[PDB]
Write a protein that binds this ligand. Structure first.
Ligand SMILES: OC[C@@H]1O[C@@H](OC[C@@H]2O[C@@H](OC[C@@H]3O[C@@H](OC[C@@H]4O[C@@H](OC[C@@H]5O[C@@H](O)[C@H](O)[C@H]5O)[C@H](O)[C@H]4O)[C@H](O)[C@H]3O)[C@H](O)[C@H]2O)[C@H](O)[C@H]1O
Ligand SMILES: [Ca+2]
Ligand SMILES: [Ca+2]
Length: 803
């Protein structure tokens, strides 16, 4: 572990270098710095105001733009939306004391998917504070007086700077295309005006590129002295038919509501290309955020990919095949017996890049955020080096930067066995994973694919696979999993498809097989109650073959059979037999499967005596709420029930149950509902230590089906995929045994899942019926609310669905 990292969360980072310091400015007024692109240190205070670091009094300072969006309005209601900034030292800028030189920050304020604007502020010193100057591109404005939900900002186009731009003849007047017919904004062809990128060209002229989804990316020339756009003035098309707009500029990528934002464009002189980066898809874990690359010889476009396809989309089409997919979801998955520990290094939804191009050395760096597998929306910044391949395309390193650099590489150090990921073009929540190949000394590639390779010169890599020639480089990289510097390669085909390779360490088949044994564990095989996951592959296509000493206890796949209540617990032996080549090893596990034990009835509110009593004796009676759990003022009638009399919930009332009704992680609930109507989220059985710690049995959940639901730290979706009938009785129940949760309907298991929260032990919880904190009370009758200490047996539940 020579190298050493120090992480931060900065979302949509724009890299910039002051003196010998690196700096990244992100959305939500986050910023951090580094000497090494490795250890980062945050120096902002987020949205704190005043004494906000970057702005001081955020609200007065930037009031120019909050008038239009980003402060306490529509989607920004209750806070601020200051997004996706870009910073750069502008030496030619004239400050307001008439001196020259200033760090400029362009930012986005947005209050809906379309009503946004770009503004900018200046400081003389990179760390701040920056001071408002002007708000300069707007989107989402209407033809006539219009307002958004939770806003009283006249959206009409006369609230924008456009009036004044026309006043100055910077425009001849309003374009009718900006509006649809109802007069709403034409975000099919015109941009959401966020995600600014400022760049210089071949001659050090300055441009702003911007846009996100909606009509796509435009670019505008900028006045180097005042930082204002030199607006086109006229509509038209460019020679290749791309849109030019008097105000928005020249469309250079995207279109027709399709994804694509986070634009960053870089002039490279060593090749004379304008490299355009843009990030496709949605930013969240399930959105498949992925970075794309094109290039143009002119800053103004046309920008095209490795296949010469336009960045600008022809219609409202899948954008998948456009641009070079240089990075998306991937995972060098640890299989059993791989060194290191845990799942392996991979990213999820990596995107919104910026790039730094060290002027003296040609060295290049991709800087971006990514989420990670099994981390949810948690995000850190990452930095991957990039190297100009032989076709004028920078190719992106597989691992984050760790001091490495381009090198004279010897052939022996390449030859070997690799992990190989292929990024493709497609993008979704799906994660791309490795195959195993080897690069043989006779310049062939064998294993999970077949083909050829060469190393030209010191480092240039040629790889050719079922006709596809990928061009890039070879280079050493830090592998956190093995904790070593490993040889590696990254390379682009003429489809604009990247493949990445990491070298595995030489290892005899004997060696591998013993490694796999050593890593093969099954956890607790002494108190076994549910099926065991028997892995069938180890590292490097190692076959793990499983036999059983008794398939009545457990199958070769790990299907267990719990003996009956009151039966002895049963034993058996599983034999892993691990094989690579002719090498083999053998690890055994002795298993014990436990019989069912009967869960034990602890409270029963039958309502059978026109009262709220617990016929077990164990608990005090229920008492009556209003429409919420912590209020009062309701009525409970007692109508005829599924079994004797039932409670009546009239939509206004609910029932409060003793705190600590449940107090374990080994418990169960049964009850019978006949619902008169169905309101989303409205609970039946509600249990809660507090409003971020609760469990709720819901007839029509967020998916519109019945479901057992738990939130907010963490959420957990017990989805039945089954819809309750009104005006009819339906028996419900659920088990919880230390982590394990099942849910039954009308006797039948509809959900089984795992890792369910322990919400009723380490304090004391409130409990209720039909009411909660937030949603309509329950309408109708609830019957035979039985509560148990133990996880109910499947047979016990079919007894319950019976009468
Ligand atoms: O009394 C004043 C209130 O108390 C405080 O409550 C804290 C918040 O409320 C709790 O949630 C209650 C719950 O949320 C409402 O619906 C909104 C849902 O949020 C989304 O959650 C994500 C989903 O979870 C998974 O199933 C799946 O991954 C996602 O689809 C969900 O999609 C929305 O439907 C509803 O009204 C109510 O039942 C939380 O614990 C906490 O955040 C507040 O200060 C105040 O309001
Ligand atoms: Ca950006
Ligand atoms: Ca009853």
């Amino acid at each position: 572990k020579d190298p050493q990292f120090t992480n931060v969360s900065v979302h949509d980072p724009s890299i910039v270098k002051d003196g010998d310091t690196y700096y990244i400015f992100g959305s939500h007024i986050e910023a951090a710095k580094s000497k090494d692109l490795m250890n980062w240190e945050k120096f902002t205070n987020g949205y704190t105001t005043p004494n906000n670091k970057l702005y001081g009094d955020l609200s007065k300072n930037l009031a120019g733009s909050f008038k239009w969006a980003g402060e306490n309005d529509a989607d920004s209601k209750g806070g601020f939306a200051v997004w996706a900034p870009d910073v750069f030292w502008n030496k030619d800028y004239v400050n307001e004391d008439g001196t020259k030189g200033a760090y400029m920050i362009y930012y986005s304020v947005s209050s809906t998917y379309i009503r946004s604007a770009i503004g900018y502020a200046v400081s003389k010193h990179i760390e701040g504070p920056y001071k408002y100057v002007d708000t300069i591109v707007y989107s989402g404005f209407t033809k006539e007086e219009a307002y958004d939900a939770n806003s009283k900002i006249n959206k009409k186009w006369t609230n924008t700077n456009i009036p004044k731009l026309i006043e100055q003849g910077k425009l001849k007047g309003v374009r009718a295309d900006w509006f649809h017919n109802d007069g709403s904004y034409n975000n099919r062809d015109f941009p959401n005006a966020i995600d600014p990128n400022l760049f210089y060209d071949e001659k050090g002229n300055l441009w702003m590129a911007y846009g996100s989804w909606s009509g796509g990316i435009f670019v505008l020339p900028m006045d180097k002295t005042t930082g204002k756009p030199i607006y086109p003035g006229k509509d038209g098309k460019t020679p290749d038919g791309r849109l030019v707009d008097r105000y928005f500029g020249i469309k250079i990528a995207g279109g027709y509501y399709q994804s694509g934002e986070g634009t960053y464009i870089v002039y490279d002189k060593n090749t004379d290309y304008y490299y355009l980066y843009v990030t496709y898809g949605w930013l969240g874990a399930d959105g498949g955020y992925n970075m794309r690359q094109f290039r143009s010889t002119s800053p103004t476009g046309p920008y095209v990919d490795a296949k010469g396809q336009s960045a600008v989309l022809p219609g409202e089409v899948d954008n998948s095949p456009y641009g070079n997919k240089i990075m998306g979801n991937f995972l060098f998955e640890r299989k059993v017996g791989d060194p290191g520990t845990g799942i392996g290094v991979g990213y999820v939804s990596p995107g919104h890049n910026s790039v730094y191009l060290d002027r003296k050395t040609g060295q290049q760096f991709l800087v971006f955020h990514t989420r990670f597998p099994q981390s949810g929306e948690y995000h850190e910044v990452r930095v991957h080096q990039m190297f100009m391949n032989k076709n004028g395309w920078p190719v992106v390193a597989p691992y984050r930067y760790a001091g490495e650099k381009l090198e004279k590489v010897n052939k022996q150090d390449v030859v070997g066995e690799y992990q190989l990921i292929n990024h493709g073009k497609d993008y979704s929540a799906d994660i791309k994973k490795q195959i195993f190949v080897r690069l043989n000394r006779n310049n062939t590639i064998s294993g999970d694919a077949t083909g050829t390779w060469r190393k030209i010169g010191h480092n240039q890599a040629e790889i050719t696979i079922d006709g596809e020639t990928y061009d890039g480089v070879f280079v050493r990289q830090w592998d956190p999993t093995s904790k070593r510097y490993v040889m590696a390669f990254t390379a682009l085909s003429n489809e604009g498809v990247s493949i990445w390779g990491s070298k595995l360490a030489d290892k005899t088949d004997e060696e591998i097989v013993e490694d796999v044994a050593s890593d093969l564990d099954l956890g607790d095989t002494d108190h076994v109650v549910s099926n065991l996951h028997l892995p069938t592959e180890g590292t490097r296509h190692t076959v793990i073959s499983w036999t059983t000493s008794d398939a009545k206890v457990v199958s070769e796949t790990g299907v267990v059979h719990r003996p009956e209540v009151g039966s002895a617990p049963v034993t058996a032996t599983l034999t892993a037999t691990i094989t690579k080549g002719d090498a083999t090893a053998t690890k055994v596990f002795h298993i014990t499967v436990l019989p069912y034990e009967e869960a034990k009835l602890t409270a029963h509110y039958s309502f059978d005596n026109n009262d709220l009593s617990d016929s077990t004796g164990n608990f005090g009676p229920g008492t009556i709420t209003g429409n919420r759990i912590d209020n009062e003022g309701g009525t409970i009638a007692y109508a005829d029930g599924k079994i004797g009399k039932a409670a009546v919930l009239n939509g206004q009332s609910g029932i409060r149950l003793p705190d600590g009704l449940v107090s374990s992680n080994q418990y169960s609930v049964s009850l019978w509902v006949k619902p008169e109507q169905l309101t989303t989220h409205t609970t039946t059985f509600f249990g809660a230590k507090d409003p971020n710690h609760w469990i709720s049995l819901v007839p029509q959940g967020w998916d519109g089906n019945t479901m057992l639901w738990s939130g907010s730290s963490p959420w957990y979706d017990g989805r039945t995929f089954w819809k309750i009938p009104t005006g009819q009785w339906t028996h419900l129940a659920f088990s919880v045994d230390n982590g394990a949760v099942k849910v039954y309907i009308n006797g039948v298991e509809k959900f089984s899942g795992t890792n369910f929260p322990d919400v009723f032990t380490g304090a004391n919880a409130s409990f209720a019926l039909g009411v909660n904190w937030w949603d309509p009370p329950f309408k109708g009758l609830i019957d035979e609310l039985r509560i148990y200490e133990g996880a109910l047996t499947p047979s016990q539940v079919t007894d319950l669905a019976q009468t």
